[PDB]
Specification:
It is built from 4 helices and no strands. The protein is an all-alpha fold. The chain is globular.
């Protein structure tokens, strides 16, 4: 999937989001480096958290 800078994923109006970003899974469109910086765990570990917890973590981070 296409990747975009963290600031773009956090600070873009819904209508303006790049077509290649799943708005419900913005974390999948972060580079591996940005994912590591933002979440501090592997992508698999994050995916193993309950969906509601993934969402809650993302809300504070501007990625919900």
């Amino acid at each position: 999937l296409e990747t975009f800078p963290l600031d773009v994923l956090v600070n873009t109006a819904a209508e303006d989001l790049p077509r290649g970003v799943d708005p419900s899974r913005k974390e999948n469109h972060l580079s591996d480096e940005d994912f590591k910086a933002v979440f501090g765990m592997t992508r698999s570990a994050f995916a193993n958290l309950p969906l509601w917890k993934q969402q809650n973590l993302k809300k504070e981070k501007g990625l919900f």
